[PDB]
Amino acid sequence: LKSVHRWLSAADQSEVVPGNDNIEYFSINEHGRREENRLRLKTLLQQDVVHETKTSTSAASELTAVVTINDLLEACQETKPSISTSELVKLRGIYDRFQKDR
Amino acid sequence: MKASLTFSLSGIYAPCSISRDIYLEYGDKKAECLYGTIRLPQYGPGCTPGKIVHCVLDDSLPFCSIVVPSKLFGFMPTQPTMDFCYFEPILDNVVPVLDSVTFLINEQLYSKLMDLPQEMQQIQFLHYKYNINSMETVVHSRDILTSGLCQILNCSPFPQGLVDFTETQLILVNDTEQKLSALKYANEDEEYALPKIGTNSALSIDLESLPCTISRDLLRPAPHINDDNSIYAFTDAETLLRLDVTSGSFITVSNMGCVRLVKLFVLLLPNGFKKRTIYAPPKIIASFPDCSVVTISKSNIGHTDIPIANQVFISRVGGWLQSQKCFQNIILTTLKKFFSESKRILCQNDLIPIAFDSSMADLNIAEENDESDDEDELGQYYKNDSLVWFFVTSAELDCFSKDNSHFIIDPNRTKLITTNITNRRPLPLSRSNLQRYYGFAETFYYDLHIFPYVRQLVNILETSFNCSQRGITLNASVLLHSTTNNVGKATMVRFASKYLGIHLLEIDCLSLTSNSRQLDSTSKIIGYIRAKCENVLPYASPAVIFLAHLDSILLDVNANQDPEAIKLQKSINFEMSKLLDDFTFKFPGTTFVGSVNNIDNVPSSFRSHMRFEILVPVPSEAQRLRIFQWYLSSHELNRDVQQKVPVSYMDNISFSSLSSYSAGLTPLDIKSIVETARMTATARFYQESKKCGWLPQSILITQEDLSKATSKARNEFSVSIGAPQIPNVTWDDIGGIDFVKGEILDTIDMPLKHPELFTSGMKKRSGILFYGPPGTGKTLMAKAIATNFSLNFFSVKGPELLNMYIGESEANVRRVFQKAREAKPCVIFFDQIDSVAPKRGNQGDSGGVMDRIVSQLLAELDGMSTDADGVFVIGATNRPDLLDEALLRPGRFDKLLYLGIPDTDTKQLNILEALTRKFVLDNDVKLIELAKLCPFNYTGADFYALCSDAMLNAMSRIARMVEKKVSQHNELTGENISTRRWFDKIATKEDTKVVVKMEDFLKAQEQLTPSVSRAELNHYEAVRANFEGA
Amino acid sequence: PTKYEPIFVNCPLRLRSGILLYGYPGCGKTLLASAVAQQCGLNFISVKGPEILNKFIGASEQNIRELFERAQSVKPCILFFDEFDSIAPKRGHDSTGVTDRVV
Amino acid sequence: NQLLTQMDGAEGLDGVYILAATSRPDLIDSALLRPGRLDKSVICNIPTESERLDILQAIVNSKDKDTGQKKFALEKNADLKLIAEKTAGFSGADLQGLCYNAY
Ligand SMILES: Nc1ncnc2c1ncn2[C@@H]1O[C@H](COP(=O)(O)OP(=O)(O)OP(=O)(O)O)[C@@H](O)[C@H]1O
Ligand SMILES: Nc1ncnc2c1ncn2[C@@H]1O[C@H](COP(=O)(O)OP(=O)(O)OP(=O)(O)O)[C@@H](O)[C@H]1O
Ligand SMILES: Nc1ncnc2c1ncn2[C@@H]1O[C@H](COP(=O)(O)OP(=O)(O)OP(=O)(O)O)[C@@H](O)[C@H]1O
């Protein structure tokens, strides 16, 4: 979870910066409109709606999520031992008593 | 208004000539450019949405006639054109102006447009190219400016309107994929005078069902008064030329020894039917096990047909409806009505269809009358809902016995005579959609390539159909069972039946007796079943007996029961079992298609015979897409409403997102959504019509509406499961709990947003619990999640589960978890877990039930075979040490979050601001000293008491002020009113607006105690140290 | 004993009918059960949690009768009890016998 | 744990005013003393030295039954201060007891 959180934080701008060539646009009579990027996105979405398809391609697992020891050790640092430390002795005693007798 | 029609090869934007009469008496004389709207009537279930046009005076046009460019509809007037339309000149010449229009252009013209130097120069070039003018030319959508060059991709504000070519944005899109090559202006696929020379004898051509009924008004020729629509056929003009006669008198269709006489008309041009094929109504098609291709020939002797109509022999075809007692009367009456026509023709082996209304079975409108009794107009109120056939065998020959191929029936000579029940196969859905033709409630058209389970059923039934010529008793029973109601079992059964053409018997739970069954109920049931079946099975080949809701009749033995009551249950079970197999070998091809809503309760004695059990899952993402595509279709919405304005969806909708956003909903829910969307769209349309704005000629569903209709449907569902109405807390109130805030976000929402990285069966740690000193947000956080996340929120009201008896607590826990598991994205809020899950096996406790219940918790909460982990569990306590360790483990409750006292002035100011947020604070003084002056032993809840106390003091001040004012007024007058009367006679709203000044805060802070002593706080601190310090 | 049945068919002299697991929470023994439930191929009946008891008078006895009857009538299977304490406490009870008659 | 749930549960009620009393209150659980519930704690005091006159005058002048303009048989002088001081501050019910005893 920590590793995927870090990856998502680092990957926010990966899909925003690059240009899109899936469709070509001429932009005539654009004067009088303050919005530029949102209008381009809406035009692209209109064209995609006219040409919508459901199929999608796969991606390499490592660039979706990956496990690293640097975060693993920190996760180990925030310990959460299930067994109650004050209760381990009692449990050990009762387990032994069960094992030896009955 | 109805106007005569003709076409020309003019430009798309060329003005449309209109006759002088209409231009003067209805056209607006003050308008510089007159605009009207035209509707093209076409062979379909409704008129087309109106298209707007610009018109000008033309004296050359005859009475009530118009001329328009054929290129406005993508064709040329080479073939016979339509002769009239419906037209109306817009009153006040109101038209809208589109802000933006999206065009798709070819690569060459786009290159030319870059080559063109300047924006204004390009604008003028487009002006000359496609006759587009500012505030003068009107544009439409889904139209083509020129073949293979440009197309109107989209129009946002309205489907049609004026263009501010000076300012309207033109979204020009290059056709990078060369899609424009698919455009085709009704052009010919070449043409030859004689593709085959001297082929007068016959022609071979395809036969397919005519997709819709036909209205006489749309017919080019002028047939006589009667005996027309029963033998119509329609084709393209050139096919008529290949037959050497244009819309010839009569044609004959002959194959497999069956020869029929037909009448062929020309298919009118604007319709978009396929090429080189015969289009005919079901009446003629039903006569054949038709091959995809069929041969036809000239028949001139058909014009010399003979009325030999004496003593005709008729027969009721086998079918479910024909054997019903009540329907038979209306069937007889409608058959007599059909044969009441003067000149209907008929020939042996013909199937004659007969439609009628299902619910008029009891409405005897009137007795026969001496004169002036007719049905024609009287029927227009009601439209048919059921269909049957009649099979005709023989007729008199008389002195004209030289020929008997085709003949007329005359009411003056024909009499109603019938024989016993015959039998014949239905028409497979793949060849002719009868419902479509007769506008019935169409059974959903499944697509076997996508839906898994239906394929199994259809395969089984078609196997039993094909084994007829193998001739063995291989027929097998089939049982459908589902995890939930309303999953379309009966629909898919009807689909299979209609697809394979298998007569369907629909017995159901409209039985006669189910309470106090000792009163011979077994007989009343089984005799009824046997009587209903025995009147159909001997005349259906194959046949299907469908028993809806069989679950609620073949009940199984109850754990607790009367010893003798159960005997009736056993008897009915056994006799049902017997009659199950009796039909198996008493008739060939019989298939028993039963349905059940929970297979666990079907009797093993009955179920053991079963050999095919199909579970029908709730439709996954892929299916819902298709279901939406269906219910949104034109042939669904436009039906059954009869609204004078046709209906349609706006193309900007998106199946792909809609499907994903409608997860978990059953098909009935989907239809509910569609219906609600239709309602809201119609309400919007009539609201706009009420307003003075421009009136669209069609009502358009919008995704912006579906987005909230789906939410309302989901809220309806949430009410179904009985969840409480949690208050509307917002995610912003939580204040100084950022750490826990993020922790919660990382589990409740992180694997729910962008559901791809977590999309796996992993242990997604659906457990979380808050613990710590009293009053630090544990319940508020839950209240927020209950409404800010759209997850179903189940409340476990403390020791709600515990119960009177020994085992009903153990039933309550399991019922709670089962019901939650029914709705996968759900939350369980164990508030004060202490009362329900105490430490197991302590000496200082009695009864032991508290141990059993906690054990059951440990079992069902985690257990084994767990899947679909979306069931979160959120618990809270003041102190955890009373809980058992076996709960304080991953998989159940991984992290214990200690929402401690903030101990930090940043957090203190944060919580003070979050509490003060939503009421006005006077800013003359700064609040920070309120944090600085409180010692850190003060607690989130007592800062709430601080704020509320300060508010109450400051508002008591206003109360005293208004008291003084009312006392002063009473002194001025005769003291004739109290405060209560003052508040309805007089109002001083602005005076009552209490605004707190921090002086009030500095007063209150002196008076309020901390919510906990140091004694308790050290205890909880030590608790945290034990659990968190490690 | 199902995998190697000719080895196990002979010599019915001595055998052990069942096994009892216990240990610290989280030591995989539920997962041991799960794996043994599915890979082994032997049928597996999952009476998880004290669902045995029932409201009505002495219904527990009849319930166990039915359970063992289904176990026998199903081909060889494992009766899986978990949180055994919930279904078989010590002999002594101040309450009704409906909670110890079951034992 | 039920009362807490019904008091400030997720589906929190409204328009209901819980009014509690007892002699020894701190034996109420601290989670019931948390402000937001039972939030204002109000002491009552028996000593009220020299204020016992006010109560005395009240109880003697109590007119609950409007049929008569009095129930207790007051006298003209009404020098209640002497007895009020003489009371030595027993309780609040003590004075009603004195009233009835003297009557
Ligand atoms: N998958 C589906 N596709 C289209 N329409 C459906 C579907 N499932 C149900 N319907 C609609 O439901 C009605 C008939 O199916 P219905 O919901 O009654 O099924 P059923 O199997 O009889 O259900 P149940 O036994 O749960 O009551 C029709 O209005 C039909 O349009
Ligand atoms: N940090 C905080 N943020 C927002 N509201 C708070 C906060 N602390 C206290 N409150 C308010 O004071 C009350 C505290 O609610 P809380 O969720 O702590 O109740 P609870 O779980 O029933 O508490 P208890 O621990 O006494 O059982 C609510 O009315 C809430 O609005
Ligand atoms: N062989 C294994 N060793 C350790 N952990 C395992 C193993 N196999 C699976 N696990 C993981 O660790 C968990 C092991 O403990 P588990 O939750 O099964 O305990 P349990 O037997 O149900 O305990 P209890 O009834 O005492 O709460 C599994 O749920 C799984 O998530």
Ligand SMILES: [Mg+2]
């Ligand atoms: Mg049904």
Ligand SMILES: [Mg+2]
């Ligand atoms: Mg609480």
Ligand SMILES: [Mg+2]
């Ligand atoms: Mg376990």
